[PDB]
Design a protein around this ligand. Structure first.
Ligand code: WDD
Ligand code: CAC
Length: 501
């Protein structure tokens, strides 16, 4: 069988399962950068306020167009540099370095030069410098007319949301492409050291065969949004929780499971809560060298990338929830085989805030130096609480919550055990009263194992707490005093034996 458990058709999805949204309104905990009274389906949102307002401080994005970006005006310099005809890739490198002189011997542009000169055919290169790049320059230089409202940083411990237009995101991402954000470049920076990279200079470095695919994916997006402005909104929400379950005493039952070795989160999990297997610095290596699950999603839905402008590194009790990002590309492969396929026309419905009905949550797993480290109770509890924070929606009934669409979170380079991570996510989803849709990407044995364990536990009516206690027992009996790198007995066999005895 290609899938097991509850039919995916029985799982809750947005918009069908959602509640009526409240009136979109700015407040203490919600920054709204557009005119809500003029928000209309199929119309480009109007920025609020009408005239540019600047904040240059430690609580807000430092905009490139600020009069405090300096002594001469760096914004004036950016304008002069970028309003030149590009005909060769050195012209673009020289332009970017005119307002980044301090990095002229540090930043490598080999991948940009190679993409333009050695990957693209002549007509594609001509279209890039005659049309796409000039259009990207123009939307970048329009920033003060587009992003008129200061953008607060989503700093650690803040529970805060920013809702902005897709067009505003496009102007900001064009600026990131041209590397115009100040104070975001130094290796030894104090300010913004706890924030991800935003400027795209590392995308231009080196000779990985992955860079042309990343650049094809991003220019697909840039060509689309400069040619016809997207009309919707996107919300970025930082969520930080204090009260976490007493997992050992949780009497809640497990919820439903659909598990499959075919399909993908972003396509087969339409309208569900889609997990991004995140780096604590959200987006990971998207505009440097990474190309696994998080980077792929950030490339095919590039509006995610702007979370790096304002999202501080995630602490253990935090996540980032992004609602409304649009898919602009299709792809094949994964990591070293990733290829851009074609432009994608997103068919998702929009909600009453004109957001695409696509909800993604960034939750970062731990990176384990040793395999057995992840069975330590403090580490299991950490992963449980991280997933719980990513799945919990405090003031929402469970009937209005979509299923969670996820997979082997943290089980690649970070050393996670897929069977443990599956069960941790199942327990966190149960505590948050959400069903689980789990994708194993070709691993049919894993699909069967997760299904079998789930049905075993549910048929025996074991609670979240019952299961967590078994995890603690597995640590104590097979991990704590294990002198070898791997345990004598595996987790799921241990669980079966413990319960059946
Ligand atoms: C979103 N997404 C995919 O699209 C995807 N494609 C492939 N195929 C081959 C690569 N290996 C397959 C088995 O797992 C390890 C990776 N793996 C994928 N994974 C893990 C994923 O998360
Ligand atoms: C743009 As700078 C000189 O603050 O790294």
């Amino acid at each position: 069988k290609k899938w097991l458990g509850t039919p995916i058709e029985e799982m809750r999805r947005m918009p069908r399962c959602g509640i009526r949204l409240p009136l979109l309104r700015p407040s203490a905990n919600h920054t709204v950068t557009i005119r809500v009274d003029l928000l209309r389906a199929g119309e480009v949102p109007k920025p609020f306020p009408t005239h540019y307002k600047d904040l240059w401080d430690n609580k807000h994005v430092k905009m490139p167009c600020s009069e405090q970006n300096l002594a001469g005006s760096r914004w004036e310099l950016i304008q002069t540099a970028l309003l030149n005809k590009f005909t060769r890739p050195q012209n673009l490198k020289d332009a970017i370095l005119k307002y980044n002189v301090a990095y002229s011997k540090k930043w490598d542009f080999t991948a940009l030069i190679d993409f333009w000169d050695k990957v693209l055919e002549e007509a594609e290169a001509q279209h890039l410098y005659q049309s796409i790049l000039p259009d990207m320059v123009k939307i970048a230089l329009c920033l003060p007319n587009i992003c008129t409202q200061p953008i607060p940083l989503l700093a650690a411990a803040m529970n805060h949301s920013i809702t902005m237009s897709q067009e505003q995101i496009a102007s900001l991402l064009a600026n990131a492409f041209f590397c115009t954000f100040p104070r975001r470049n130094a290796k030894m920076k104090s300010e913004y050291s706890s924030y991800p990279d935003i400027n795209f200079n590392r995308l231009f470095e080196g000779r990985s065969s992955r860079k042309p695919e990343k650049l094809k994916t991003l220019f697909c997006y840039f060509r689309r949004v400069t040619a016809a402005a997207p009309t919707g909104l996107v919300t970025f929400t930082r969520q930080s929780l204090e009260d976490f379950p007493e997992w050992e005493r949780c009497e809640k039952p497990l919820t439903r499971l659909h598990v499959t070795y075919e399909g993908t989160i972003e396509e087969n999990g339409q309208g569900m809560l889609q997990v991004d297997f995140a780096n604590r610095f959200v987006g990971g290596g998207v505009t440097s060298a990474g190309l696994v699950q998080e980077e792929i999603r950030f490339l095919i839905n590039p509006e995610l990338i702007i979370s790096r402008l304002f999202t501080e590194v995630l602490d253990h009790n935090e996540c980032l929830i992004i609602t409304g990002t649009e898919q602009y590309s299709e792809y094949t492969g994964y990591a070293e085989t990733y290829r851009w396929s074609r432009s994608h026309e997103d068919g998702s419905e929009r909600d009453d805030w004109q957001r695409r009905c696509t909800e993604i949550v960034a939750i970062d797993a731990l990176h384990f130096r040793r395999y057995l480290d992840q069975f330590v109770p403090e580490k299991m509890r950490r992963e449980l609480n991280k997933a719980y924070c990513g799945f919990l929606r405090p003031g929402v009934s469970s009937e209005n919550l979509s299923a969670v669409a996820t997979g082997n979170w943290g089980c690649g380079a970070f050393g996670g055990d897929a069977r443990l991570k599956a069960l941790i996510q199942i327990l966190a989803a149960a505590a948050a009263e959400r069903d689980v849709v789990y994708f194993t990407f070709g691993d049919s044995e894993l699909m069967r194992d997760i299904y079998s364990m789930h049905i075993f536990l549910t048929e025996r009516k074991l609670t979240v707490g019952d299961v967590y206690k078994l995890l603690l027992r597995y640590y104590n009996e097979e991990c704590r005093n294990c002198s070898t790198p791997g345990p004598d007995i595996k987790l799921y066999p241990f669980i079966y034996h413990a319960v059946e005895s």
